[PDB]
Each structure stands twice: as structure tokens, then as C-alpha cells.
DNA sequence: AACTACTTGAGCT
RNA sequence: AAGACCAGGC
DNA sequence: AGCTCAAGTAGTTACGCCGGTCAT
């Protein structure tokens, strides 16, 4: 369901951080923790956003009109 | 349960939970536990509207 | 009560 | 399966704890009243005495519950046979109307056929036998 | 009846474990009363060991 | 291939069944002092283990953390009140 | 008590008194059938039993695996796999001895100490 | 349990105080059908008789003896009957039901 | 408390076996009926008041 | 945040935080009659009714 | 209790028996019904003395034996004196009873 | 589901 | 528009 | 023919306040 731009708890932005850590991922292959804290995301409270975030939109978009 | 020898009387069998919640229930206990909280659960939805006819 | 002892 | 009745079979046992009557009765499928064990077995097809103990108990060593069913076998001493034990269910026109409720309707599971009569038997037999592996605290 | 039961009973529990008599069918010796116990049934809730 | 058996209720009576597979077999020849308190597996009659004795919960307690933790009957409250929140109930 | 029947036509036994010779008769109420008596004694109550606490033990009984395991010794072959219980008298005033059963023999040894038996 | 109604108890069920002073014989149980005037019977699926208040139902025929149609049977979503039974992942999502 | 909580284990283990202990000497028809109740009702009167003063 | 009441902080109530879409349907049909007496969907006024 | 006695614990048993309905009932064992026709013998061993021991300081050749318990006379504190005593007043001069001590 | 009211039934002189 | 049924709230 | 005593059988009434779906 779409990443959430700017974290809830604090403020930060957190849009763009999404395809950087999906990445970070599947490829330079890190474990979730230390994709984070690359991507700048410090305390839990912006830690938790990308996290926790289950990209329903995907699924979504795989309905045809 | 059926996970006891029978003719078991200890307290282990019958139902004593030596466990504190910070440390937690072994499904035995877990379970008792659930047994004897549904009683519980059952008169406050009985005791409930009974009570109340009593009273009226 | 119930979930403490018998009496409680 | 197949059409799937909902009548249930009653094998009592009068007489409280104490009082000197201790008989067994049971229930069958449209019958008014109640008939006394005995002659439901030899209404059934075993008449003598014993023989009918036989299907009760299975151990001739166990005074205690065949005392039991002493009494009970003084009730139906006054039907000595499978005439009379078919008809004591309420001529000619009664004694038919008998055994319908006992191939269709008594116990029909196991079987509603005919020649079975032997095996219904066995199970009223491990009834009254169920009944009393309790009244004896078994 | 049955005479000596004690393998009737371990070979139909090892028919079952082929799968030659559903896995869902139930069979239960009660020893301590000398009697077996045969359900085929629709409803009997189950769950797996 | 024989490794597992559906147990109804009534067959169920007849057996013995062992909680952790681990734990309730090998012998002996200390222990942690956090972990909750085990009694043992004194007994080798064994018939049968449990698949995992958290499967002796149905889907509305599947979401409950640490429901080993808390006191009953209010596991059995959360146990509704999850048929009542908010989410996703399809994609479509 | 052990009671019993009759040839002939297999029925119940009731009894009747010699008169003029003083001794005890069964009989039939079917045909005519009569046999001395077995014993003086006629009917039994029973109010406190003990008959019944050993129940259908057949050798199979250390097959039951849910049934405990005491690594005791019968009082005759010395063995060490016992399997018991309580007594199967479902009588809330019974009481709790163990009866032991051995895999080696068939024995019905006891914990009791108060009393003694062999049944 | 539907499976076993269908498949086989379905059966069972027409055939036993069935003849009559005319008997009957295998029983058939089509997939999802549509019988509306203004149309011939367009083979239905979920997703439309959600939407169009319908009935996933769907024929039913009996070998009568002297083929013939007696009633619709409303067909458990996820069954065998259900067309879902089939479709795979992205099979689904074409017929926008969820996967 | 670190301690504590071994303290308390072992007020249950030894509470386990005042148990144990009484039952032995149950099997055993080594005890005699509290007039007015069964000898099994006595039993358990004492288990029972044997682990609550236990867990108190 | 007392008496099982909570406090909730705006701020990231703002940020969309369980903020959740609600949908709803009404529904109707266009009645009608063995004798040919159909309804209509239109955009009425006056009329003599 | 009365004003007086209050601590007497011997006191409170004393009258707990005087008021607890005890029935003949809770206290046999066992009862039988032999067939001996001599009034002046057993066909019993263990009853012999206790017919010779009792006839110094007609009836039916039909008899009734009741086996109470030990323990149980004990409890509800009874004597055979006494449990007979009351059978034979119960039903008087015609049923003649007898027993051990 | 439990009671309590009301009237009825069968045993008994 | 009135009712019935299921569901859910303290 | 008539009367007390026990039992059966009949019948009744129960619960605080506050959206969906179906059909006469
Ligand atoms: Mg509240
Ligand atoms: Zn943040
Ligand atoms: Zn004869
Ligand atoms: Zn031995």
C-alpha cells in the first residue's frame, strides 16, 4: 500500500528510502538492520517505518483496468 | 492429558501452575490455566442478567 | 478464586 | 443411511438404592408402556433361562451381578416361550404387529434384515450388562 | 469377539500407516475393559502426531 | 510412510503423547535460571509427539505474542477483539 | 453364592425345605427337576465390597502404555517392570493402594501395609 | 466435507426410495451456469454473482428411466465446481478475484 | 531479585515433595479419616493446603 | 490517558497515522410486473405527485 | 452446649452421638441369610461358641447372619449389647435374635 | 431450567 | 413502515 | 361407596441499554 512519506514519530522523510533499501537488498545483498542505518534511518522510530512496511500496492497493480 | 500417566495425583497434573508470567506457561499450564479462567469467563456472562432479575 | 487456589 | 430415525432405546433399571424390586425394564419404539428384559429376549429368540444370562454376564463367577437379575427373571417367569413373548406386547391381529417392531424398529441399526435376531440380542445383552458395570461401581 | 487381539490391533495401525485403511478411520483398544473400538464416522474432529 | 497418524478425540484416550520431541527422549548422565520451570519425560512408553504445542491454538490466538504470558482470560478478550480491527480483508 | 440351573430344561433354581428330613432342596417351576443343596448358605448383600479392584488384568496389561512404570521387585520373581494403578471400585470412599502387575509373571502384589491380600 | 456431498453422498441420496410405481440412475453436476431470458446461459463465475446478486449454482441432471433437469445447486467458492479451484496466482488475478 | 527467584523455586520443589510425601504415605493406607470425611477427601485437603501455602 | 483512555500525538496523527478509507453501497432495482408496469431511473421534479 | 459445660470437648462428642442419625445400615458389612434347622447348633465354625455361650445367665429353621464392621463401631461408637438390644424391641416377641460380644 | 402451583391418581378402609 | 433472525458494543 | 396421602402432570415466567439481512 505505497511507502509512507516522512516517518509518523518524528518527522524525517523516508519516501525516496524505499527503492535505495529494497535494493541494498536484493543485491549488495545486507541484512535488513544494517540496510537502515546505511540509509540514514537512526532511532526506531523512522527504523520501524521501512521496516515494517508491507508494499500492498504491488499486488494491487497486478489487477488489469 | 493425554500427555500424562494415568492415575497421575501430583499437582504438576492437577493443575498447579508453578510459573510466573515473566517467565511463562508450558502448554500444560498454559492450558489449565485457560480451563480455569473460562469458568471465570462464564458466570460474569451469567451472574450478569441473573443478578439483574433478582433485583428488579 | 478460579486462576490463584482453591479458597481465593 | 437411509431415511435415518430418531427413536432411542431406554434400558432402565427400577427400584432406588434399597427397596426389594430391583427389576430392569426397557423401552421400545411405539409401545405404551415398558417391558421387562426377559421377555424381550425370549420375545426375541432365546427362552430358556441362563441362556439369557448368558448374554448378560460373561463370567459365571460373579454372584453379585446375577444376583441382580435374579428378580428380574421372577417378572417374566409367568412367559415361558416365544409364542407368549411376542403376544405380552399390546390376537393374532397383536402377535404379527410384535415382531415388525422388532426388525424395523428396535435397535435398527445393526440391521433391520430378519435373521439377525441373534445379534440385537447380544447387544441388549451388553446393554443391560453397561447398566449394571455401573449400579455395582465398576 | 477376537481371540488374541494385541496384533490384531498392531496390524491394523500398520495398515493405516501404509494407508490401506484411511488415516482417517479411528481404532481404539481398550484393554482394561477388553473391547475395540471402530469409527469410520463423519464429524469426529482429529489433528496429527 | 508411517511418520505421522490423524488422532481423533477417542483413539486419543489410548496413547501417550510427548510435548517437546526433543527434550522428552534422550537420557542422562546447570540449567538456565529464566526459562519457565519443565517437570520431565519420565516414562518411555511413548506413542506419539505433539506436531508444536503452539498448534493447540486456532487462528485468533495465532496473533497473540507471548499468549503464554498473560493471564487467560484475557487472551480470550484480544481473541475477539482482532475480529474488529482494521486492514486488509482482500487485495481485489 | 455361584448358583445354579438344571439339565433338562436349563432354568432358574429356586429352593424348598425337606420337611420330615430337615435339609435344604433347589428346584424348577418349569418341570420337576430337584437337587440337594450345595451349601447351607442362600443369599448374600455385601455392603462393604473388595471384589473387583484386580479387574480384567489380562497379560496384555503392559501393553496399555498409558500406565505408569515402579522399578520395584514382586514378592516372588524378582523382576523390576511393574506397571498399577488404584482399585476400579468407583467409589468415592474407596481407597489408594497401588496394585502392581509384573512383566515377568502376571503377579498381583500390593503397597498396603495395614492389611493383606492374594485376590 | 462439500467434496464428499457432491462427489459421492449426492449420489447415495437419489438413489434409494427413489423408483416409483420410473426410476433413477447416475446423477450429473455441471459447473457454473447463467439461465437468463435474453440470453442463451453464459457460463458464470464469483466475482459476477457477487457483484450482480446472482447464485453460484450450478446444473443438475438425472438418468430417469421410463437427461432430464432437476434444480441448481449452489457450488462452494474454492470447491472443485469453482472454476478457483484451478487458476493459479496470476490466473486469479485476471478474473479479479483475489488471490 | 536475582536470588530471590531461587528462594522461591526451591519453596516449591520442597513444597513438591510434602506432596510427594503424603502420598506415599497414602499408598500405603498409612493415615487415618478425619471424621466426616472420605479418606481420599482428606487426601486432597491436604494437597490442597499444602501448595497454597506453598504459592502464599 | 487515564481510566483506559489514551493520548494520541496529533502530530504523526497528521502524518497519516492509522488514518483508513471507508467505503459504503447502497443499491436498488427497477421493480416490475407480470403486467407490464415498469419503474424508472430518472431525474424527477413536480409532476402532479 | 448447655450454660455449664462449654470447653468440655468429651462434653460435645457426648451429645454428637446422641443426636447423628446412625441407621444399622452404616455399620454392616455384610448380610446372609443360611439355612440351618437346629436351634441348638451351626452349620457355621466361627458362630459354634457363641450359641453354646448363650443359654445361661418353636422358631424357623431359617436363618439371617449380619457381619458389621470393627472400625465402624468404633466411629459412630455403638455395642452389640446395645445394636441388638434395639433390633429385638423393634420387632419384639416374634423374631428371636442373638449375638457375639 | 427450575420450581412452585394446581389438580389428579392410586392406594387404602 | 412493522416484525423476525444473525451479528457486535459497556 | 368413600377418604386420606402421595405423585403426576400441567403450566408459567426470565434477561439492563445500544448494524446487517430476509420476507409478509
Ligand atoms: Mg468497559
Ligand atoms: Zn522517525
Ligand atoms: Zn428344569
Ligand atoms: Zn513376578
Redesign the pocket.
Given at each position: 500500500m505505497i511507502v509512507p512519506v516522512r516517518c509518523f514519530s518524528c518527522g524525517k522523510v523516508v519516501g525516496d528510502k524505499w527503492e535505495s533499501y529494497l535494493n541494498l537488498l536484493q543485491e549488495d545483498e545486507l541484512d535488513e538492520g544494517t540496510a537502515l542505518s546505511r540509509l540514514g534511518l537512526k532511532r526506531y522510530c523512522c527504523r520501524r517505518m521501512i521496516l515494517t512496511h508491507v508494499d500492498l500496492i504491488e499486488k494491487f497493480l497486478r489487477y488489469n483496468p | 492429558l493425554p500427555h500424562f500417566s494415568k492415575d497421575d495425583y501430583s499437582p504438576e497434573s492437577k493443575g498447579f501452575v508453578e510459573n510466573s508470567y515473566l517467565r511463562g506457561l508450558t502448554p500444560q499450564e498454559f492450558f489449565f490455566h485457560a480451563m480455569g479462567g473460562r469458568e471465570g469467563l462464564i458466570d460474569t456472562a451469567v451472574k450478569?442478567?441473573?443478578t439483574?432479575?433478582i433485583q428488579? | 478464586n478460579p486462576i490463584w487456589g482453591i479458597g481465593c | 443411511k437411509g431415511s435415518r430415525f430418531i427413536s432411542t432405546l431406554q434400558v432402565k433399571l427400577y427400584g432406588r438404592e434399597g427397596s426389594s424390586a430391583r427389576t430392569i425394564k426397557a423401552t421400545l419404539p411405539y409401545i405404551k408402556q415398558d417391558i421387562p428384559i426377559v421377555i424381550i429376549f425370549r420375545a426375541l429368540g432365546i427362552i430358556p433361562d441362563g441362556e439369557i444370562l448368558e448374554h448378560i454376564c460373561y463370567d459365571v463367577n460373579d454372584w453379585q451381578m446375577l444376583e441382580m437379575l435374579k428378580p428380574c427373571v421372577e417378572d417374566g417367569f409367568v412367559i415361558q416361550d416365544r409364542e407368549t413373548a411376542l403376544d405380552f406386547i399390546g390376537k393374532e391381529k397383536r402377535i404379527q404387529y410384535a415382531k415388525d417392531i422388532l426388525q424395523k424398529e428396535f435397535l435398527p441399526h445393526i440391521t433391520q434384515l430378519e435373521g439377525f435376531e441373534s445379534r440385537k440380542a447380544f447387544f441388549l445383552g451388553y446393554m443391560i450388562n453397561r447398566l449394571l458395570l455401573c449400579a455395582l461401581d465398576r | 469377539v477376537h481371540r488374541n487381539p494385541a496384533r490384531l490391533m498392531e496390524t491394523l495401525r500398520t495398515l493405516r500407516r501404509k494407508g490401506d485403511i484411511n488415516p482417517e478411520v479411528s481404532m481404539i483398544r481398550d484393554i482394561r475393559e477388553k473391547e475395540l473400538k471402530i469409527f469410520t464416522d463423519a464429524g469426529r474432529v482429529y489433528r496429527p502426531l | 510412510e508411517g511418520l505421522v497418524e490423524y488422532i481423533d478425540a477417542e483413539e486419543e484416550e489410548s496413547i501417550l503423547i510427548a510435548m517437546q520431541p526433543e527434550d522428552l527422549e534422550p537420557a542422562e548422565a546447570d540449567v538456565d535460571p529464566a526459562k519457565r520451570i519443565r517437570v520431565s519425560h519420565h516414562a518411555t512408553t511413548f506413542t506419539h509427539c505433539e506436531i508444536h504445542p503452539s498448534m493447540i491454538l486456532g487462528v485468533a490466538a495465532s496473533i497473540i505474542p507471548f499468549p503464554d504470558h498473560n493471564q487467560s482470560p484475557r487472551n480470550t478478550?484480544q481473541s475477539?477483539?482482532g475480529?474488529?480491527a482494521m486492514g486488509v480483508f482482500l487485495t481485489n | 453364592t455361584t448358583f445354579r440351573f438344571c439339565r433338562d430344561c436349563n432354568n432358574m433354581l429356586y429352593p424348598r425345605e425337606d420337611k420330615e428330613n430337615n435339609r435344604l432342596l433347589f428346584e424348577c417351576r418349569t418341570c420337576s427337576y430337584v437337587e440337594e443343596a450345595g451349601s447351607p448358605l442362600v443369599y448374600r448383600h455385601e455392603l462393604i465390597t473388595n471384589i473387583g479392584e484386580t479387574a480384567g488384568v489380562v497379560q496384555d496389561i503392559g501393553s496399555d502404555p498409558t500406565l505408569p512404570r515402579s522399578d520395584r521387585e514382586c514378592p516372588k520373581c524378582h523382576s523390576r517392570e511393574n506397571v498399577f494403578f488404584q482399585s476400579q471400585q468407583r467409589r468415592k470412599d474407596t481407597s489408594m493402594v497401588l496394585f502392581f502387575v509384573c512383566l515377568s509373571c502376571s503377579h498381583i502384589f500390593t503397597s498396603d501395609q495395614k492389611n493383606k491380600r492374594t485376590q | 466435507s462439500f467434496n464428499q456431498f457432491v462427489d459421492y453422498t449426492l449420489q447415495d441420496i437419489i438413489c434409494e426410495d427413489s423408483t416409483l410405481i420410473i426410476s433413477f440412475g447416475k446423477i450429473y453436476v455441471t459447473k457454473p451456469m447463467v439461465n437468463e431470458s435474453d440470453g442463451v446461459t453464459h457460463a458464470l463465475y464469483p466475482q459476477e454473482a457477487r457483484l450482480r446478486?446472482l447464485t453460484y449454482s450450478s446444473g443438475l441432471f438425472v438418468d430417469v428411466k421410463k437427461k432430464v433437469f432437476i434444480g441448481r445447486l449452489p457450488i462452494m467458492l474454492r470447491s472443485k465446481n469453482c472454476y478457483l479451484s484451478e487458476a493459479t496466482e496470476s490466473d486469479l488475478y485476471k478474473l479479479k478475484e483475489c488471490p | 531479585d536475582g536470588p530471590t527467584m531461587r528462594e522461591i523455586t526451591e519453596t516449591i520443589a520442597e513444597a513438591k515433595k510434602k506432596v510427594l510425601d503424603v502420598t506415599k504415605e497414602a499408598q500405603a493406607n498409612l493415615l487415618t479419616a478425619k471424621h466426616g470425611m472420605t479418606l481420599r477427601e482428606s487426601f486432597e485437603d491436604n494437597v490442597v493446603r499444602f501448595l497454597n501455602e506453598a504459592r502464599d | 490517558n487515564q481510566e483506559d483512555s489514551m493520548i494520541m500525538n496529533q502530530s504523526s496523527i497528521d502524518r497519516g497515522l492509522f488514518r483508513s478509507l471507508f467505503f459504503?453501497s447502497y443499491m436498488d432495482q427497477e421493480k416490475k410486473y407480470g403486467m407490464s408496469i415498469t419503474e424508472t431511473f430518472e431525474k424527477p421534479q413536480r409532476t402532479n405527485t | 452446649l448447655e450454660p455449664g459445660h462449654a470447653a468440655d470437648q468429651e462434653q460435645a462428642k457426648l451429645i454428637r452421638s446422641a443426636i447423628e442419625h446412625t441407621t444399622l445400615k452404616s455399620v454392616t458389612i455384610a448380610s446372609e441369610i443360611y439355612y440351618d434347622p437346629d436351634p441348638r447348633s451351626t452349620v457355621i465354625p466361627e458362630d459354634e461358641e457363641i450359641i453354646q455361650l448363650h443359654f445361661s445367665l418353636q422358631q424357623s429353621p431359617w436363618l439371617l447372619r449380619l457381619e458389621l464392621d470393627r472400625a465402624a463401631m468404633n466411629d459412630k461408637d455403638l455395642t452389640m449389647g446395645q445394636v441388638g438390644e434395639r433390633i429385638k424391641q423393634t420387632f419384639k416377641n416374634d423374631l428371636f435374635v442373638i449375638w457375639s460380644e
Open positions: - | 450478569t442478567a441473573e439483574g432479575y428488579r | - | - | - | 478478550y475477539a477483539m475480529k474488529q | - | 446478486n | - | 459504503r | -
